Structure formats: C-alpha cells, structure tokens
Amino acid sequence: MDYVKPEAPKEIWCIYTERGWKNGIDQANTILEENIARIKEDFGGMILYRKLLAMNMVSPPYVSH
Amino acid sequence: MKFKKPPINNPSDDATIKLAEAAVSVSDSMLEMAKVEKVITPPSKDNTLTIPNAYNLQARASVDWSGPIEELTARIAKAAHFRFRVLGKSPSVPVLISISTKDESLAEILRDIDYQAGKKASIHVYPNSQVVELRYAKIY
Amino acid sequence: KFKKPPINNPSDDATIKLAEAAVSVSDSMLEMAKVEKVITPPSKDNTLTIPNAYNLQARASVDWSGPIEELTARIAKAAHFRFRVLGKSPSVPVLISISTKDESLAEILRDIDYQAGKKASIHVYPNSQVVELRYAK
Amino acid sequence: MKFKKPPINNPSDDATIKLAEAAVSVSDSMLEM
Amino acid sequence: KFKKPPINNPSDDATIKLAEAAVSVSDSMLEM
Amino acid sequence: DGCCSKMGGINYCDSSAGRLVCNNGFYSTCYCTRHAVMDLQFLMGCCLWHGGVYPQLNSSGLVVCNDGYVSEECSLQK
Amino acid sequence: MYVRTNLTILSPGWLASMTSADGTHAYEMQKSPVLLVSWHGKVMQLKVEGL
Amino acid sequence: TGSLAGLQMALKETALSVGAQAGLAWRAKIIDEQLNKQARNLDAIYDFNSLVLEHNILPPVLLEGRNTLNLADAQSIRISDRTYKVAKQAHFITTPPTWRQYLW
Amino acid sequence: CFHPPYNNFQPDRRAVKRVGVDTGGGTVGLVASIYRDSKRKIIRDLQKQDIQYVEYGDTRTLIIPTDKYFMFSSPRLNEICYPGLNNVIRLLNFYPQSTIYVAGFTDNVGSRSHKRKLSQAQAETMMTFLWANGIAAKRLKAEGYGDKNAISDNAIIHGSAQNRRIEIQWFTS
Amino acid sequence: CFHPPYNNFQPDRRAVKRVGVDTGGGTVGLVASIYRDSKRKIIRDLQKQDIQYVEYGDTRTLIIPTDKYFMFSSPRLNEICYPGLNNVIRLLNFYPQSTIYVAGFTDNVGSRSHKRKLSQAQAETMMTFLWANGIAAKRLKAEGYGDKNAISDNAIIHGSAQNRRIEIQWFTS
Amino acid sequence: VPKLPCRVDGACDATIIKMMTDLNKKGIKVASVGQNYLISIPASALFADQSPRLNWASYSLLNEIAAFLKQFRKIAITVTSYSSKYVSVKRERALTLARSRVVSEYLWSQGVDSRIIFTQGLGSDKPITSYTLGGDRSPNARVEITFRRAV
C-alpha cells in the first residue's frame, strides 16, 4: 500500500474529525481486502492449471528453437 | 471463582486476520492438487543415489537464503572441505532458490537444493574424490 | 538468571495461523518437486570419466568461445598426445564456451564432452597416447 | 587495553581511490593478454 | 642526526595501490 | 554526531565501501556516501510498483500512474 | 532506464540484459522508482530519484 | 498529521546558486592538484605510445559483451553467447593521445 | 533453595523457607504454610496461570494450551513456563492410586498424517515429563487425536486457538 | 650511550642511564628500571608503535605492517623505524628455547611469481635481522606466501592495506 | 539526508568498544586480526561436567554475546566445539556436536542477522595447550565462534 505523509491541514469539531478518522480507517481495510482477492486470483488460476494439465484437460505449450 | 478460558494471547490485527484466511485456502488447494499429482504419476527414483553422504558431510547448518544457487553451493562445499565444480554454461535468466530451514545436515541441504533446482540444474557428489559438482541444463 | 523468549515468535492467534499455513505450503512444494524431478543412476551416466594419466594433471588457463575441434586439438597438443577425428563436420559447427583461470586438462576435456551434448564425443586412450573426437551420425 | 590495527596511514582522496580502481582493472587486463 | 623519508613517497593506501599498478603495467610492456 | 567515539576520531571517507575509517584501524558504523549498503525496506511516495506518477495536472483529484492504474488511495476524496 | 550494477535485479522485470567478463551486469528496462535486489541472500530495495 | 491527538523564499535559491559554483570550482582545483602530483604514474599506466601499429596507425576500438538475452516482446526471445562490435575505426595519426585530454 | 529448571527432579523443601522467614513467628509461619499447601490455593494458582481445571463426579480433567506450554510446532517443552508444570506435579501428588490418560489435540490446518504425528509427539512428551517426576509406568497412557472431536468452531480465529490443547483425565478408583 | 643504527648489534646498557640520572635516588632509579624492563610496558610500547601482539594458549604471534617497516616495493629495511625493531629484540629475548617461524604476505595486485618472490625476499630480510642479533640458526625458519590465506577483503582499500603483513609465530616448548 | 538512514541501525562504536572491554575482563577471549573475529569461551562457564546441559545462569552470558553479535553485519558464522579426552573418540565427538547444536540454536533464537550458521564438533583433536591435567577445568575445552565482518 502507498504512503505519502499528508502535511496539508471547537465545540463539535472533535467528534466529526473523529468520525472522518473512522471512515478513512474503514476505507483502507476495504482496499487491502480487494488486493488480497487479486493475489489469490493469480495464484489460484496457476495452481488450477497444474491440476488440469495433470488430469489431461489442457495441452502444454509447444516451443521451437 | 473468576471464570477464564485458557488461550489468552496478545491482541491481533485484522490485516493479519485477512492474510491468514487467504493463506488457509491456498494451503488446502495445494494439498489436494499435490495428492492428485502423486496419484497420477508415482515417482520411482531417489536422489540418495546421486548424493550419498560421507563423514564431514555430517556437520550441521541453519540457513536463510534468497538468491542464486551457485554462491550458496560454493559456501556449503567450502564448509564441508570439498572441491567445487561447475559444468555447463549459466543461463541468462538466473536460477533462483529460496531455503529457510533450521538444524539439518549438509547432505539434506544439498538434497533440498537439488529438489528446488528442478529441470534447470543438478547436484552430484563424489566422496572418493571429495568433489561437489553443479551442472546446468542444456536448455535455450 | 534470565532466558528471554524468541524475538520474532508467533505470539498472536492470527500470526500463529499464518505461520503454520506457511509451513504446510512448503511441505507441499517439497512433495511436488520430489514427484516431478527425473534423475539418472550413477551407473549409466553418459559423461566421460577422469582419465588420470600423469600428463593430464597439468594446470591451465583457457578463454575460448568457438568451434570444438580447434580447442580440443590444442588441449591434446599441450598434453603431448596425438589427436584424431572420426566423422564428418556438419554445416553449422559445434560451438562451446570455456572460461577458466586455473583448471587441469582432464576436466577441461570433461566439460568439453558435457557441453558437446549428443552431437560429439571425446575418447581418451592412455596406453597409445591419443585423444579422439567422434561425431554423431 | 586500547585496541588498534596495524596500518594507519595518511588520509586518502577519493579521486585517488577512483584512479587506483581504474588502474587495477587496466593492469590485469594487461596481464591476461 | 637526521634522515628524512623520500619526498614523493607513497604514504597513502590509495597511492600505494596506484604505484603497484603502474609497476606491473610497465613490466607487462617490457614482456610484450 | 559522534561517529568514531572511543576511537581516535575520523580518519577519512572510504568511498569504495562507503564508510568512515577511524584513527585506529576499525571501520566505522557511519555511512559517508549514498552508494553504501543501507538496508532500505520502507519507502514513501505513491505509484510504486507502477511507473510513478504520470505528471499531467488534473482538474479533478485523481492520481494516475504511468501504466494506467489509478491510485484511489492518493486521490483526494469527495 | 539503463542500469549498471553487479547486484541481481529481482522484481520490476527487465527487457534486455548483458554481462561483462568480470561479472558486471547491464540491464535495459521500463521506468520505475524502486528496484528490488538480492545482495548476498538478503532482499532489499534501491531507491531511484529524478524520474 | 499523526493521530487524533496530533490533529486535535528568495534567499533560498540565491544561497544555493552561490554555493554550487564555489563548491564546484574549489573541488575542481583540488582534483587538478591531485592529478598533477601523480603525473609520471599515469603516463606509465596509459601508455598509448607502445600500442601503435606499423605505419603509425592507431588501432581500432573493439567492444565485447557476454551471455546476451533480449526479450523482444511477448511471444519472442533472442539469445546469444558473445557479441563483438567495432566502436571506432583505425586511422593515421601524427602524435599519440595522452591522458590529459580525458582527465583534466 | 530452588533450581529453576525442575529442581533436578527433587521435591523442593518449600515449607522451611516460609517458617525461616517467619521465625527470622512459628505459628504465623505454620498458618501461611498450611494455607499455601492446600488444594484450593493450588487450584487458584493454576487459575492464575492459563490452565483450566474441571471436576465432575469422580473424574477430573486438566486443560492445557499448547500456545504457552510448547514452543511453536515442535515437541519441545517451553522452559519459561515451569511454575505451571511444578504446580501440576503438586496437584497430581494428591491422588496416588488413580490411572492417568493424556490426550493431544490440534486444529484443522495441514495434512492428516501431519496432525496425527504432531499430536502423538506432544502427548508422549507430556507423559514422559509426568513419568520422570516419580509416577510409575503402569499408571499412565498417552494418545494423540487429530482434529477428531473439537470443542470449538474451526472457521473462526479465537475458537481455532481454543481448539489446540492437551487433555489430562484421571479417576479416583 | 646509544648508536641509532642498531647500536652496532651490541646490547645497550640501558639501566645505568636511568640510575645515573636518578643518582645524579638509587631506589627511585631501581623502581623506574624494574618498571620499564618488564614485559607489559614493552608490550605497551609495541602497542604505541604500529605492531600487534596476540597471545592464545602457548603460541605467540607478532603482526608487522610492511607499510611502515619496509621501503616501498623492495626488500630494504626502513631505518627510521628502529625503536620498534629494538623493542622486538627485547621482547624476543625472553624466550630463549623456542623455535621461530616468520611468514610474509602481500595483497592481490600483480602477477603470481612476482608476489611469491617479493614475499620470500621480505621474509628472508626479517629472518636475517633476527639471526644477526644473536639468535642461533637452528631456531629459525622463513616462508613467503603470496595472497594465499588473507585476513581481510581485497576488494576494499583499507582491508587491502591490512592484508600486507609479516607474521611471527613462536611456541614455548 | 533526514530520510536516508545515517548509520547501520542499533549500532555504535562506543558500545562496541565497551562490550569488548567488558568481555575481555570477564574472561571470554575476543580477538580481531584484520576483519576476522574470534570469540573463545571456556566450557566450564557454560556447561555441566561433560553433559550438554546448560546451567541456568549462563544464559545471561549467551545474551551478552548475542547483544555483541547484533552490532555487526555478516553472512556466515561458524561455531565449533572442542573438549578433553575422557573415554573414546566417539563419546566426545558426540558431546561436542551436541554442545555446538544447543549453543547455535539459542543464538539463532535470538536475533542475530546472519544468513548461515555452521556448527561442528571436533572432539579433542586440536589442542591449544600441552598442559592436559584438568578435566573440564582444562583451558583447551572450549567453544569458538568465528566470523568475518562483511563490508
């Protein structure tokens, strides 16, 4: 995940700054969960390829030199 | 009579929770497919024939390495007091290995390296001449 | 007096689960590599053995990347042997690459035979002092 | 029991460092040919 | 009462290596 | 500040290794060039593992990397 | 980018490569502000400015 | 910046512009003094005079590369073992080159 | 005094230390000794550490978390947690006629043979530690079950942590 | 007095100078003499110059930098550094039964025969200097190794400076 | 400069000199020739009488040595154990191998940032002293930890 330090900035100011803090934390967790899904996609697709090559449902790549 | 249940660990992060949940599913996919591959083509030969042991191959090591194969094999041979030999041409795309073990013998370190090398390189040991020999594949 | 715990110890019930999953995946890799790898027995390995004559233990220093015939003839001449060729040179020659700083001529010959592959072979006769390069039909 | 290691010379200039590093490679290329 | 070191002496661990390289190159030149 | 403390002080910067040499024959722990082996594991900025920030100036707040990916994370919210 | 080093570049993926006789590597690749290298079995990062 | 508790210039460029030039000139002087101190060793090392060919012809400049790979795009690769190239061609000279045109 | 690694498997002369710091009163030292060698304070000390005790009928059971009493994924015994093991020996010293069963349990991650072998190893290690403290070989039995009969749900993190355990059952007759 | 080039290979009558400047007290002159002819002050004087001393078991080793005790790239001995050589003779005077090995080492720049020949020459020069100060010929041996077994890394400048050295080993029996 | 590191982390020259001086006064031999480093420990300060069982109080010394080893940067460490002659060659070869295995494991458990640790036990084959009258009190029953500082 990408980090840049933000240096670019009272009765009810505190509670809404705190609510915005909770919203940002929740958004970051959601972004991480989609990244986890993407890496799982790539690894699971390759692993499934190995199983179907073993069970003779795909053809291997043929190479000429 | 305060009530308590035994595992009380340190607090956890939900990132680590999500990472663990992904890792478990990866793990049983790997287990099922490995079972299928073992059933389909049963192996017949073992690399104890090509790498037998000897005296002073029974010194021990613990290793954490994430680079190319040749320098690490040279370090093991130098620790075992053997000569080191290379056959064939090294490929342009390097052969990378990754070993993370604890307290095993040097013969098993070489056998694990030999298994991870795969179709790209091979390890042979001649104990009467005290030679460790790594040979590259005739590919490309 | 004191015995500290390990510094990076999995002291967390999510971290614990992550570390065993990492253990079992690597176990499966070792199993797959053991099934997939093919080996040859050391009895029937087709590589020329070390011929242990006295003249072939001299040390050398070779940089070469070119045809096999010229380099093998020079190696034979340096060992005070004779050299003979049996076969036909192809249209595209057989190309090897030797780069060493300190090495004896017998293993240089062994590397020459390994790099030649199926197209050529090197035989050494130590009684009648000769080496012979044989092509593949 | 002050610890010391034997060669303690005058301070060096990094230009001389770079020139020496070029000269060594020139010298062993020269040796080989 | 007094001895002095040579005035242009390689009293520097980079200069020493420079002078050794300069010696060996000229040796190779005489051989060629 | 004090690099070669409990040694004799700074002798010179060895630029071949990127390290200072103390007045006894010990290598120092201080670096003296930027091409020294520092063990960097944490880097700032965004669009890493892409091409970096594509340098057009945008009317909206989207930040786009050089390979077409869009950083929603460095992008300002509404 | 054209990179001259004798470390081994791992992650960002290069387009062409050559090697000298003493073990120096030269790489041609696409632009990126970070490189992942292996030093002696240890994975680390190099940081590239000026892009 | 930080946490909940944490949230709850022309002389600049004129200084850089006079510092860069002075540093560059001073370091250039020191480099030239170090070059002039070691003038005989560099003449012994970069001995162009004893590489000259028969009719006072400077030899050509050749370049070498080893263990070459190019990934041309997806679906095609090209590999080679060594490559040699003529970077510069031979010509007549009247005087040999010296290190001073390069290093000064 | 006390040697911290298992006191060379000797019974520690614990009471004399209290009666020496109290004679250095004799009656107050005897009351403090007869309180702390009683069964309920030992049970509360296992409660103070992370060990659970269940009594139902004439069957008694100890529940031990491998997370704190073993090193990670190995049959080696964690030496920092020796007070709990010494308290286990002290509590088990009160029933010198019964037979003991020790059973080992893991969670669901991994292969089946791996789970069974690790359970068997951990159960044998704890049985050997019991046998080496004086208990005769005819009174003991160890068994390792895999993920056979769980007590929590393996699809959630804390329940999966609660599933990895060692069970000690013993009778009265 | 003292002749600065090696005192014509005579043992210098050093103690009488101190007891003459102190009688010119006798007890203070004897205490100053018995301090400075002791082994630890001689060891500290070699520490004050650039010579290293290592003692491990009953094997003793002196490490000498050629950078200060020889002229540049020659087997000639540097005459400005005679206090160190005199202190070497004084320290070696304490072990009159042992056998001596002197070994010479260079760095990696140059050709192999050149490195070997220069090492052999420097080792013989230091052995001849030892033999000329009284030590019998049956107690000495010199050997020159090339870049055979280095103690630092030759790819960096300071370690390469540390690699050029003379080693002196001796036993007790 | 404020965001690049200015030194290798957790390391200080005064701390290196301080701990080396304290170890030499305590009795553990620390020596340095060139860039190679040797730490030599008598076996009596670590083990019981020829058993591979540590005392409880010697773990403070192993902790101190680990705190010393974290000050450098390195690639390989070698631990070798040597003992004195008791019964046969095999019994002390097994003893020295067990001793080196245990010591290198505790050092690996603490955070020494090495890539390889090699362990071997040589028995009573290489004595550094001809006086062989002690048992485990002898000066030539020891463990030696050697390494090379890298760059």
Author numbering:
A (entry chain CC): 153 to 161, 173 to 228
B (entry chain CD): 23 to 162
C (entry chain Cd): 24 to 160
D (entry chain DD): 23 to 55
E (entry chain Dd): 24 to 55
F (entry chain CN): 39 to 116
G (entry chain DH): 311 to 361
H (entry chain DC): 28 to 35, 57 to 152
Task: Provide excerpts from the study.
Legionella pneumophila is an opportunistic pathogen that causes the potentially fatal pneumonia known as Legionnaires’ disease. The pathology associated with infection depends on bacterial delivery of effector proteins into the host via the membrane spanning Dot/Icm type IV secretion system (T4SS). The Dot/Icm complex of L. pneumophila is one of the largest known T4SSs. The Dot/Icm T4SS has as many as 300 protein substrates, a striking contrast to the H. pylori Cag and B. pertussis Ptl T4SSs, each of which transports only one virulence factor.
We have determined a 3.8 Å asymmetric reconstruction (C1) of the Dot/Icm T4SS using single particle cryo-EM approaches. This resolution made it possible to trace connections between the OMC, which contains 13 copies of the asymmetric unit, and the PR, which contains 18 copies of the asymmetric unit. Unexpectedly, we observed five peptide chains originating from the PR, with attached densities sandwiched between the PR and OMC. The models that were generated from the 2.8 Å resolution, symmetry-imposed reconstructions of the OMC and PR were fit into the 3.8 Å map of the Dot/Icm T4SS that was generated without the imposition of symmetry. First, we observe 13 linkers between the OMC and PR (identified as residues 264–270 of DotH) in various conformations, revealing the direct connections between the two regions. Second, we observed five small globular folds located between the OMC and PR. These folds consist of two β-sheets and incorporate the linker from DotH as an additional β-strand in one of the two sheets. Close inspection clearly showed that these domains contain folds nearly identical to that of the C-terminal domain of DotH in the OMC (residues 278–360). Thus, there are 18 copies of DotH in the entire structure with all 18 NTDs comprising the PR, 13 of the associated CTDs extending up to build part of the OMC disk, and the other five CTDs extending up only part way into the intervening space. The flexibility of these five DotH CTDs suggests a mechanism through which the symmetry mismatch observed between the OMC and PR can be accommodated though the utility of the symmetry mismatch cannot be inferred.
